[PDB]
Model the fold of this input.
Amino acid sequence: VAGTLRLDLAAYRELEAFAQFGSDLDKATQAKLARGARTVEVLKQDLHQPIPVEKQVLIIYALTRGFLDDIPVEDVRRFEKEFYLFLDQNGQHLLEHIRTTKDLPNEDDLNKAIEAFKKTFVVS
Amino acid sequence: VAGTLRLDLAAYRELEAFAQFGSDLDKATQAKLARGARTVEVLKQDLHQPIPVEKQVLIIYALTRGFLDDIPVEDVRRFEKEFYLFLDQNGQHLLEHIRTTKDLPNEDDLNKAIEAFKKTFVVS
Amino acid sequence: ASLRDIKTRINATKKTSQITKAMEMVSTSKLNRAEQNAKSFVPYMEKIQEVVANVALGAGGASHPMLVSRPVKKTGYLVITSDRGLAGAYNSNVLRLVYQTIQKRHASPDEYAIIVIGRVGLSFFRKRNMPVILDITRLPDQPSFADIKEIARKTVGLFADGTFDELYMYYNHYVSAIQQEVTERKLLPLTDLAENKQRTVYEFEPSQEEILDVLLPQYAESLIYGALLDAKASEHAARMTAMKNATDNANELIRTLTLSYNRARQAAITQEITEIVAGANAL
Amino acid sequence: ALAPEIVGEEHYQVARKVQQTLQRYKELQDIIAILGMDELSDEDKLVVHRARRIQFFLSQNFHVAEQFTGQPGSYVPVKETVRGFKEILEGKYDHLPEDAFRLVGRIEEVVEKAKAMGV
Amino acid sequence: ALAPEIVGEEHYQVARKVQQTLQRYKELQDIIAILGMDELSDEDKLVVHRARRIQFFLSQNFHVAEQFTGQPGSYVPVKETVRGFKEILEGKYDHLPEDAFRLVGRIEEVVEKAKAMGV
Done:
């Protein structure tokens, strides 16, 4: 997932020089700007709060596959926190699989877990 | 002839910016862009091949007197190359006149010589 | 600051100048293509108006020149704006004048009525709370009569059947390519005309009234279309001048930042030379 | 000492939001200078509107500056500073003139000064 | 070495044309980003269509990148690469997706990758 993150962030930073010219641009450009802003909000982190890699990979997957694109920008931090809490009680097999095999779990199962959490998430 | 050449080159270098969409008659397309384009084309020179001052005078006079208005921009170089040979073949009187007196020859004689050459030239 | 500090801002401002100049060129070509439609439209409007000059005179009318003038009930108002900004106060003048005059002359949402063209008008009226009835979100940079024809027909039909009292259009004219300003005019009742009679006895093959009843709506649509063409020309001229002034200001900033950078780097260099000389002298 | 566990989460949030708004206002200066104020988006206009007022409200009249200027000076508790800046951030005083905030103490003196000027 | 008699007339022609197309494409990024590419003239849109493919074709998979990616490398002769660029310029491959041209060797392998992805 890191390659996809790099590509998205590079496109965002290249296009950022034009975001000063209003909110009306080519229809793909504002979507790219929204994705870049969401990545910027995800990469933020508080002090003395290290994150295990098995949770980092999951949240970056959720970001990069577009599961986060319906959530507004200012709710991303709360989404990440609630998502870690949800993963603590459910989908523990995902964490164990990643932690023991250094690879992503079943594709369909991960999507199902993301959808299950997105159902119980609440938006402001 | 150098003074006449200078202004055309300066005007073209000034108006190079608006080349994509020119519609204001000559101010945008004729004798302000086309003349400059042909000037730039005749100022190109091949490597390690100098040419005599009389032939330079002939070609610059031809450019400035509008005798190249009909030639396409991509054929001006071949026009000049053929014109040098035509001069060597017929304009010995004009070339010797310049090489001796350091002055331009008769206007009508020179114009009829270039018109005779244009009769034999073929556009590609 | 540092040379490293200065270079980034110089780069950003140079890129801004580039973009503004490119947009200025595009607006110039758009204006050149935009004036052609006004040239084509003038004969149609004049030829319809000259027929009106004898058909619509000497008669009571079909409630258009009768001045039905219902005092206050959602009398219509036409607002024509752009869709993209970068035009300076072009849209601001129109929206400001419309809001002020309509708030001065009207005070009840039932007395109010607005028809808006372009995205920014809707985007501003969402900040406000005005009762919009219909809209056209976008129009190609070379709008034809047929492009706006259906909405013009809808609005003129709403004027008909007594639903709408009378209409005013608010849009920008241009004194020249460099100056653009606002006008408003009272459209449907048609209080002014001129009188000449050439075939006044018999131009009326079905009848006098019937041809007028359908000729008037088409005339009003033509008037709205002409106002639209003038608004488009004003918009393109406004973006031309706005980008020109923006590029000029950016170039001024380039000049100032460049002088500062060049003067700072020389002080740094002479500091380095002083250090070298003193170090040599110490031994 | 500017850490949440030391001064309180409310204080930390207010300080960080103030600094963020000021940094955005600083970054917008060149585009304001070249492209004009009106070309700014609706959010950036609000950012500038709040940022100028915060920048002016940071000023204060000191006791020992009574010699330079006739104003007697003021002493402002941290709680009052936090509450006033929070109210400014949430847009309670967007309609007051800019000069009302300059060189005063607590938030209420801004209201009194605006009333004196007629707001 | 990029001279007509050193590399050949065809090689010089192809290289000069590729450089011209890329340089022209460099002027349209901001315009395309701000105003939708639909407002550009028809020729310019086709120029952009070709420039994207040229840029993606300039990349190549290396033998030493085996460790970095897991894909074996390729060696492209100069005659084959100039013919491939000439074909792309003259348009007998405008019907393929741009993702096909990335990190690949000869022009035939581009068609093979496009067929693999399902064109």
